[PDB]
Design a protein around this ligand. Structure first.
Ligand SMILES: *C(=N)CNC(=O)[C@H](Cc1cccc(C)c1)NC(=O)c1cc(C(C)(C)C)nn1C
Length: 220
């Protein structure tokens, strides 16, 4: 792979969103990955509806504001034959009945790919595909209060992930030979969290916080 990647500078990534108090992180991770893949396909970045996923992807196994999986979201888009734009189907931060309208569909997918559970494979996928949906262990105060720098939490688990986010790149800080490496991660807690809503997360430390344990992307 390249030494560094940042898909934001290539037009693949919408601004940071805010999921509010709803457990819909999975929907934000999924829309982020599909926003990227649709851009790869068409050259047009269009913000997609998390609310559409929250309201409508129960049949695939999702549980709305009570949680879900990005792969189930990708399966919904495939089964449904579409996903509405954010503009047409705006975010309300609470579960409502499904009001999908095919007139306003701006995305589709033909399934998904689950990435092997290690960081070399994740790096390959980030470099060659685009932004990647991942889950992390975000269950520490250190994550809530994260400001800047490369996040490393001694108590992070590589197995207990609770939060879906989006890897939009990776790179290094300091002298290259110091191996001070990170994943560049878009969160859905607004721009006031973290570094404008982003976090740099420890890379190549044996799957810190489980970032490579549940990584996937939609096939477009
Ligand atoms: C975010 N606001 C709430 N978190 C979730 O919805 C997590 C995200 C997650 C965690 C681990 C792996 C992935 C790919 C995503 N969802 C879950 O923990 C979750 C939901 C479910 C079902 C829908 C099957 C009950 N299972 N898990 C593990």
């Amino acid at each position: 792979a390249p030494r560094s990647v940042d898909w934001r500078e290539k037009g693949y990534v919408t601004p940071v969103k805010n999921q509010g108090q709803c457990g819909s992180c999975w929907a934000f991770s999924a829309t982020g990955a599909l926003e990227g893949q649709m851009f790869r396909k068409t050259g047009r970045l269009i913000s997609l509806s998390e609310q559409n996923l929250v309201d409508c992807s129960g049949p695939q196994g999702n549980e709305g504001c009570n949680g879900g999986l990005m792969d189930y979201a990708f399966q919904y888009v495939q089964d449904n034959g579409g996903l509405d734009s954010e503009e047409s189907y705006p975010y309300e931060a609470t579960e409502e009945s499904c009001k999908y309208n095919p007139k306003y569909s701006v995305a589709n997918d033909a399934g998904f790919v689950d990435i092997p559970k290690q960081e070399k494979a994740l790096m390959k996928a980030v470099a060659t595909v685009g932004p990647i949906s991942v889950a992390i262990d975000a269950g520490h105060e250190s994550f809530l209060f994260y400001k800047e720098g490369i996040y490393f939490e001694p108590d992070c688990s590589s197995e207990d992930m609770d939060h879906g986010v989006l890897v939009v790149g990776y790179g290094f800080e300091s002298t290259e030979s110091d191996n001070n490496k990170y994943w560049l991660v878009k969160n859905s807690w607004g721009e006031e969290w973290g570094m404008g809503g982003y976090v740099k997360m420890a890379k190549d430390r044996r799957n810190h916080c489980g970032i490579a344990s549940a990584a996937s992307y939609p096939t477009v």
